[PDB]
Amino acid sequence: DGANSDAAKEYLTKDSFSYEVYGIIAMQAAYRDYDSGDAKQDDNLGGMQLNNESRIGFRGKKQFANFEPTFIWQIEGGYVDPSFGGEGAGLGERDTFVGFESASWGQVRLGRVLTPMYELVDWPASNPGLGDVYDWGGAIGGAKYQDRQSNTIRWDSPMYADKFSIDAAVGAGDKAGLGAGDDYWGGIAAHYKLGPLQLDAAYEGNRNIEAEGQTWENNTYLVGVQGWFENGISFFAQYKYMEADASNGVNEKQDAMSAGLMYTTGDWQYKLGYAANFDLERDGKTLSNTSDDVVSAQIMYFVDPSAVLYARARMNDFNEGLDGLDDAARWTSGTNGDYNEYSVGVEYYF
Amino acid sequence: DGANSDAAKEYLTKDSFSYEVYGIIAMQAAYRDYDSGDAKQDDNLGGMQLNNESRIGFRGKKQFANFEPTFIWQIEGGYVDPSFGGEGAGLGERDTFVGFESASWGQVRLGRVLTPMYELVDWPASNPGLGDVYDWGGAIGGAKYQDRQSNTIRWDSPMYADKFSIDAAVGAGDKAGLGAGDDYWGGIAAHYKLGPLQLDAAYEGNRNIEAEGQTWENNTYLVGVQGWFENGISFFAQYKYMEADASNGVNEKQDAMSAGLMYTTGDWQYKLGYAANFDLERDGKTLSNTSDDVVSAQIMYFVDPSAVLYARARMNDFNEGLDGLDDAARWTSGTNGDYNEYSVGVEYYF
Amino acid sequence: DGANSDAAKEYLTKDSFSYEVYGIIAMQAAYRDYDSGDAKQDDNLGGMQLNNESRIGFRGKKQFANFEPTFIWQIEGGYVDPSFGGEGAGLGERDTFVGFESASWGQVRLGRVLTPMYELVDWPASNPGLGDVYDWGGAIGGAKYQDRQSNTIRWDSPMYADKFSIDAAVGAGDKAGLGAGDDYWGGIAAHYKLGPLQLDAAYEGNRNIEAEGQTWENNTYLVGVQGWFENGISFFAQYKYMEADASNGVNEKQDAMSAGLMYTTGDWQYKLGYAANFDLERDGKTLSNTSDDVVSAQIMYFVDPSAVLYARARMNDFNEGLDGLDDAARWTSGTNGDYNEYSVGVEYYF
Ligand code: NA
Ligand code: NA
Ligand code: NA
């Protein structure tokens, strides 16, 4: 089977010991307390679990004898036993790609990577515990943005004059990737370094998204800032604007923000985070109680140059529900209900 | 996505070459002959298959600069092509955890491990071929015990005065681990070395188990012995008592045993095993023909310090059926039918 | 869990550093244009995708102290993000086995490997892009041959007098491997080296295949040739004959061919390929428009001793449909429809 069978094994010189095995060992003990309005549902979903996000991966680089841009590749396993999920993960569930790189133009990767929008949404703006609201939370129809996506080409510019860099990508959609649709997307992000700050902007457009009996276009825009100061304070903040249009003429808008403050002293780092989705608007009218917010607090200990321990507390207050354009409840991160969470954790890189 | 995104990669020192890749290569060619009472079912289930239980794993230890108890981790793949099952296994399907260790108090592991009761059930008392009866075999409602389980904290004491040790654990249940229930369990085991013998005891309690229209509590108790003598004989034996109670008042009891005899001489080891589940009792009344037994023989050759070859024959006589508390047949290891099996195998550890 | 639990870990000497990690990194950017007769189906299936056939594997060899034939094993992961498929692959999805070897009698492998017939069908005769027609393409009932199959024992003879070798195997079928049937197969292939040519023959017989309300027997025969000349031309050609019989008396025949021509000069290789299935015959009558063909072209650049780049164009014209013996459409590689494809790719071996 395959584009070239096992011809590589049979005929090419094996480039032996030209790989690296790496891993992130990550374990979070997390207790949740739900207030869904059904006591049974609250017992099911709540309680204590262990969220094992450990993963193994493989990567390398090769300078080919007859091609100047260095070849690069990586294959990264999924999380091995996350909470709310069964055990076991395959290779290639996370960032998994091939590509090429040259000083003058940066790097191009083909495969499964983060979109430029998602990379900023995820880090810094989803940490700590903010993701349910700011990563996949939201009430808009269509697809606000992809996150980690297969069938993607992505270019990462170099750092021009030590200050400026661009991330750009296009790819197939979730259905297209299975031969079941013609969804696609593109997007771009930029970063400007500036004394102690960095400025971020990003865009993502998603086309031919099918959902709720309709085809959608999405556009999503974002701005934010980040700073680190010599006194040990650092922070971030962002604003995120989301628009969608359906094939039947319906328009939808919703916006959001996320911010964090952090103080690093000696081997410690304290951190507070807040993020919010505001009420959604459909065809000019606001839908009441379609907003979400989350507050979070964290302390982290630099236990080894290669590792950290952390404790964290957070409160999610989610929206009270909406219908999509087919008269059915639209799934949101709030569908399972309001919940709080206490957790401790460890992360180690080899 | 995740508790900390890719922050570990981006900010921590990579602790390079601080891992080990290991594996157990294991292949059993096994021929089964079924006598289910349906000739078609006998052809399907019987015949020759290759039971590939090979697996790969990853593990290590790290002495963190600011924490005295040594960090330990492991991630172990599932069996790659076992009989009765499709090809392929993910990482984390087997014992997969993080933890910490200190000479004075032993070791604590968090993640996916064997329960203390299951560890003694499995080894020595399931070998060879005794598992259909004594591992997952049985007729009791609820859950007699978990086996390999995610969402588990487990403490392994040291060997106190060279003689005594304890294994203790608690964790979430099979439903809880998916946010679909509030099942949990706890258990403990102890071991006492004593001239040529070791004595074992263990317990497991499972709570909020849903099955058959009811919530169950289970309690399981076990006692056994193991011995090795200078003449090359060794053996084991165990007695296992299982009780369950349902939310509607029904009580169930069933007990069981397993024993093995071995003679080790030069590069060989001969082995006979026997295990049995006795007739089940429900609300004081015995249910006839709800018992199971199995007899097994084996010869094994120490073909290398790192490997063994073996041949094995066994005969399983399973129970004739029972209904659970919803008037539906209750699945047991006997539901598929009586069968015999001849096998040969190899196992290698690197 | 398992034939011998964790006994190997606990009692055998760990044969440390006695393994190899290897991979093939393989990425094909492929654009398809379908002409199915439904424009919607054409958009879904067509478009651009990235077909990531990268995989990781593990292998090794061990000279056991008390057994002369060297022990061999391998475990090979599946493709990590192929087109038309979700992300992620487990270990053991590809050639995964244990075995033994001796210079005087060759090698025996037990596990999951290619059938002797399929190996010749796949390579040389499915490259480049010929597979939809000549690999899994066809209209015959039953199973023309297995491809990569678990539950297989396979013997690879040595090269007798530097000229002659045999590949032979038997194993369980797709249903048998899950305890759901008594299907099996056997097959054999031979190769005769002869100045610049090699002659191939092969056979496969499949028994107790259930499909379309009937039990089938299949027999498949193949002859071909291959040559490499010092001037830089090489080629291959094959003829493949497929017969089937059903339990209700129906007979089916179909034949096929595949050929390729190659010119290798300096760092380049040009390649043209053609393959065809001819009209199928059932109970002596030909069924019109049940044939398939494909033409393909390719250029490949030997970019490094360990790697290649390539570009490729191909045109598949498939059959127009048939019914199986139950009055329902029989699935073929033409069911989705005629399509063309342009692709570029890279392959690297470490
Ligand atoms: Na996605
Ligand atoms: Na379980
Ligand atoms: Na098959």
Residue numbers in the entry:
A (entry chain C), B (entry chain B), C (entry chain A): 1 to 350
Authors' description from the paper:
The addition of micromolar concentrations of chitooligosaccharides such as chitohexaose (GlcNAc6) causes a complete block of ionic current, demonstrating tight binding. Here, we report X-ray crystal structures of VhChiP in the absence and presence of chitooligosaccharides.
We expressed VhChiP without a His-tag in the OM of the porin-deficient E. coli Bl21 omp8 strain and obtained reasonable yields (~3 mg from 12 l of culture) even though VhChiP overexpression appeared to be highly toxic for E. coli. The purified protein was crystallized in the presence of 0.4% C8E4 as detergent. All residues of the N-terminus have good electron density in the structure and a number of polar interactions can be identified between the N-terminal plug and the barrel, most notably between Asp1 (carboxylate)-Arg94/148, Asp1 (α-amino group)-Y118/Asp122, Ala3-Glu53, Asn4-Asn127/Arg312/Glu347, Ser5-Asp122, Asp6-Arg94, and Lys9-Glu76. Thus, five out of the first six residues of the N-terminus make polar interactions with the pore of the protein, suggesting that the plug is stably inserted in the pore.
